Amino acid sequence: PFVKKHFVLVHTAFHGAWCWYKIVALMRSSGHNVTALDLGASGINPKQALQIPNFSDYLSPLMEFMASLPANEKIILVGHALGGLAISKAMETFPEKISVAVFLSGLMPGPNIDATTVCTKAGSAVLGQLDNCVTYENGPTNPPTTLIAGPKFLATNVYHLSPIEDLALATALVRPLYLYLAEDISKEVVLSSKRYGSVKRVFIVATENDALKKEFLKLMIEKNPPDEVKEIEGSDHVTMMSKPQQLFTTLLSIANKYK
Amino acid sequence: FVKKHFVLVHTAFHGAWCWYKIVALMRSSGHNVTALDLGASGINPKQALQIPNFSDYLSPLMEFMASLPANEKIILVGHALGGLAISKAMETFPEKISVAVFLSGLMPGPNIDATTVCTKAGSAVLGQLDNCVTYENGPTNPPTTLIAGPKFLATNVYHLSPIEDLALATALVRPLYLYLAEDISKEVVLSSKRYGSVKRVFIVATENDALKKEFLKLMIEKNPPDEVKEIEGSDHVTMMSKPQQLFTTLLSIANKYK
Numbered sequence: 343p344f345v346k347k348h349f350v351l352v353h354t355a356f357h358g359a360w361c362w363y364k365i366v367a368l369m370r371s372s373g374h375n376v377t378a379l380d381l382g383a384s385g386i387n388p389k390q391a392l393q394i395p396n397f398s399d400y401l402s403p404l405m406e407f408m409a410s411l412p413a414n415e416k417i418i419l420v421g422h423a424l425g426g427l428a429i430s431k432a433m434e435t436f437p438e439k440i441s442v443a444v445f446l447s448g449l450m451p452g453p454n455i456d457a458t459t460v461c462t463k464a465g466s467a468v469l470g471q472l473d474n475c476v477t478y479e480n481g482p483t484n485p486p487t488t489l490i491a492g493p494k495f496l497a498t499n500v501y502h503l504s505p506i507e508d509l510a511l512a513t514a515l516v517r518p519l520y521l522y523l524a525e526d527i528s529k530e531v532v533l534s535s536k537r538y539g540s541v542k543r544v545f546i547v548a549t550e551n552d553a554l555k556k557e558f559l560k561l562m563i564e565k566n567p568p569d570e571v572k573e574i575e576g577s578d579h580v581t582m583m584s585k586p587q588q589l590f591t592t593l594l595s596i597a598n599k600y601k
Numbered sequence: 602f603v604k605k606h607f608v609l610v611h612t613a614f615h616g617a618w619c620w621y622k623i624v625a626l627m628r629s630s631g632h633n634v635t636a637l638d639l640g641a642s643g644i645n646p647k648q649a650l651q652i653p654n655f656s657d658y659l660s661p662l663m664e665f666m667a668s669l670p671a672n673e674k675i676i677l678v679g680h681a682l683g684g685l686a687i688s689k690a691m692e693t694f695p696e697k698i699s700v701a702v703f704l705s706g707l708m709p710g711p712n713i714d715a716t717t718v719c720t721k722a723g724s725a726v727l728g729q730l731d732n733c734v735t736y737e738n739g740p741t742n743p744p745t746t747l748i749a750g751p752k753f754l755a756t757n758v759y760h761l762s763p764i765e766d767l768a769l770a771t772a773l774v775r776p777l778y779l780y781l782a783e784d785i786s787k788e789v790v791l792s793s794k795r796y797g798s799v800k801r802v803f804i805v806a807t808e809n810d811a812l813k814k815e816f817l818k819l820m821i822e823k824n825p826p827d828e829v830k831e832i833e834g835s836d837h838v839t840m841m842s843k844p845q846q847l848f849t850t851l852l853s854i855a856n857k858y859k
C-alpha cells in the first residue's frame with residue numbers, strides 16, 4: 343500500500359539543490375514529495391557568499407522551509423556532509439516535524455562532540471587540499487573570507503567514483519563557501535537530548551569516501567550514536583552522484599522503517 | 602588530432618551547466634571547452650533585475666571574446682536564444698572564430714532582423730502552460746521577467762530527455778529579463794563584411810513541433826549559412842537528449858572548418 347512521503351534534501355559546501363537531481367527524479371517518479379533546497383549563496387540562491395557572513399543566513403532557507411511546513415506533516419530530512427549542521431539545527435528547533443533525520447557522510451555533532459569540534463576537524467580536510475584556495479576580502483589582518491573548491495580537489499577527493507559528466511556539472515556549478523567563524527557556528531548549532539536527541543537518526547556511510555576520512559566519521563558515530571548506521575559500498579563522497587539508485591532504495595527503506 | 606577550443610553558449614533560463622554531457626565528452630577526448638554563463642544565468646552573480654540591457658546579458662561572452670589573443674581561434678556554439686549572443690560575438694570579433702554553429706539557434710541576418718526572430722521565438726514561450734511573468738516595474742509597465750515553469754519544461758523543452766535532466770533543470774532554471782525589441786535591434790547589428798565573413802553552420806534539431814521547424818527553415822532561407830546539418834530525435838535541449846550525437850556533429854564541423 344503506497345504511503346506518500348516528503349523527502350527534504352540538504353546539500354554540502356559549495357553545492358546546491360542541483361546535486362540531488364538523480365535522487366529527485368527517482369523520488370518524483372515514484373510519487374513521493376521531495377524538496378531539494380539551496381542554502382545561502384548555494385545553487386541559484388540570490389545571495390553572494392560575501393553578503394552572508396553570518397551562519398544564520400546560510401541556514402535560513404532550511405529554517406524558513408521548516409517553519410512553514412503544514413500542520414502535522416512530518417518529513418525525512420537528509421543532510422549531506424556540511425548539510426549535517428543545517429539539519430541538526432532543524433532537528434533542535436522543529437523536532438516534531440521530522441520523522442527521521444539522515445546524515446549522508448554528514449557532520450553529525452551532538453552534546454558530547456559539538457559543532458565547533460566537528461567543524462574544526464572538517465576544515466582540516468578541505469582547507470589546503472590540492473587546488474582549493476581562500477580569499478581575503480577583509481584584508482590580511484582578518485581571517486580568510488571564503489573557500490573556493492578547486493577542480494582537481496573535486497575530481498580526486500569528491501567525485502572520483504562518479505560519472506565524469508557529473509564532475510563537469512559540478513565544476514560549472516560549485517560556488518564559494520563563506521568561512522563562518524567557529525564562534526558563530528557554536529551559537530547557532532546547539533543540541534539538546536530532549537529535542538535534537540529525540541529525533542530518529544540514521545547515518546549513511548560512503549564506503550570509498552576520500553573527502554571525509556574514516557577516523558573522523560567513526561569518531562562522530564562513536565560519540566553521538568545514531569539509531570542506525572547504514573552503508574553504501576563503492577560510493578565516493580557524493581553518493582547521490584556515484585550510487586544514486588542505491589541511495590534512493592536506502593532512503594525509501596529508512597522512510598518506511600521510521601514512518 | 603589537432604586540439605580545438607569549443608565555446609558553448611546556452612539559451613534562455615539556462616546556463617553553462619546544461620552542456621555538462623558535452624563538456625565531459627570534449628575534455629576526455631582532449632579538446633578545450635568553455636561553457637559560459639550569460640548574465641544572470643547559471644551561477645553568474647547578477648540577478649535579472651540588475652541586467653535590464655541586452656548588452657548586460659551578453660557581457661560574459663563579450664568579455665570572454667575580448668580576452669582571447671587573436672591567434673587562438675574557437676568554434677562558437679550558440680543554442681536557440683544563444684544564437685543572438687554568438688551573432689554579436691561574430692560581428693565584433695569575426696577573426697577569432699573559425700566557425701559559428703547555431704544549434705536550432707536564432708540566426709538573424711541582413712534579410713531577417715534580430716527583433717523579428719525574437720518576437721517569433723517568444724510567442725512559443727510567453728503564455729505557454731505554467732510559464733509566468735513578473736512586474737518589478739509596477740502593474741502599468743511591461744512585464745519585467747519571464748519564468749519557465751516545470752510543466753512547460755517537461756512537455757515543451759525536455760520531453761525527449763532523461764527524467765533526471767528535467768529535475769536538474771527545474772533546480773537550476775533562472776528568470777530571463779524581457780528585453781525590449783528596441784534594445785535588441787540596436788544591440789545586434791550585423792554586416793556582411795564582419796558577421797558575414799564568419800563560416801556558419803546551422804544544426805536543425807527539433808522533432809514534434811512542425812511550426813518550430815518552419816521557423817528554423819525560415820531563418821535558414823532568409824539568412825543562408827555555409828551548411829545545414831540535422832540531428833534526429835532531439836527535443837529542445839539537444840545537449841541533453843542527443844549528447845553523443847551532438848558531440849560527434851560538433852567535432853565533425855570543427856575538423857571541416859579549421
Ligand SMILES: CCCCCCCCCC(=O)O
Binds near residue numbers: 422424461465
Ligand atoms: C569552517 C567552515 C568550513 C567547513 C568545511 C566543511 C566541509 C564539508 C565537506 C564537503 O566538502 O562536502
Ligand SMILES: CCCCCCCCCC(=O)O
Binds near residue numbers: 612723
Ligand atoms: C528576450 C525576448 C523575450 C522573449 C523570450 C525569449 C525567447 C526564448 C526562446 C528560446 O528558447 O529560444
